[PDB]
């Protein structure tokens, strides 16, 4: 029933708002939606588990796309999508 909180690291390793997610890729998904989420150069985002000393580090972008195969009528040829993959993993102390 619990969802684990995360923290957003900056360019220096600094810290930001408390993110959450049942899995680090959620915190990351909500890190994609954050700003420079582009597939040309995803908004590099650093998550930090408030449990493990493992700085999860994904690259996070958005693509307003998803042209319909079997989609609903109201659902266009694209949609708001924050996409994140993890390129590696960083470490807390």
Curated annotation (Swiss-Prot):
Coiled coil regions, renumbered to chain: none
Keyword DNA-binding: yes
A GO biological process held by the record: DNA protection
DNA-binding listed as a keyword: yes
Region (Disordered): 1-44
Signal sequence coordinates: none
Protein name: Chromosomal protein MC1
InterPro entries registered for this protein in UniProt: MC1, MC1_sf
UniProt entry keywords in alphabetical sequence: DNA-binding
GO molecular function per UniProt: DNA binding
Described function: Protects DNA against thermal denaturation and modulates transcription.
């Amino acid at each position: 029933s619990n969802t684990r909180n995360f923290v957003l690291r900056d360019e220096d390793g600094n810290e930001h708002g408390v993110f959450t997610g049942k899995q680090p890729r959620q915190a990351a998904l909500k890190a994609a939606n954050r700003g420079s989420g582009t597939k040309a150069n995803p908004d590099i985002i650093r998550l930090r588990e408030r449990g493990t000393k493992k700085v999860h580090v994904f690259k996070a972008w958005k693509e307003i796309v998803d042209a319909p195969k079997n989609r609903p009528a109201w659902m266009p040829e694209k949609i708001s999508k924050p996409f994140v993959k993890k390129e590696r993993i960083e470490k807390l102390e």
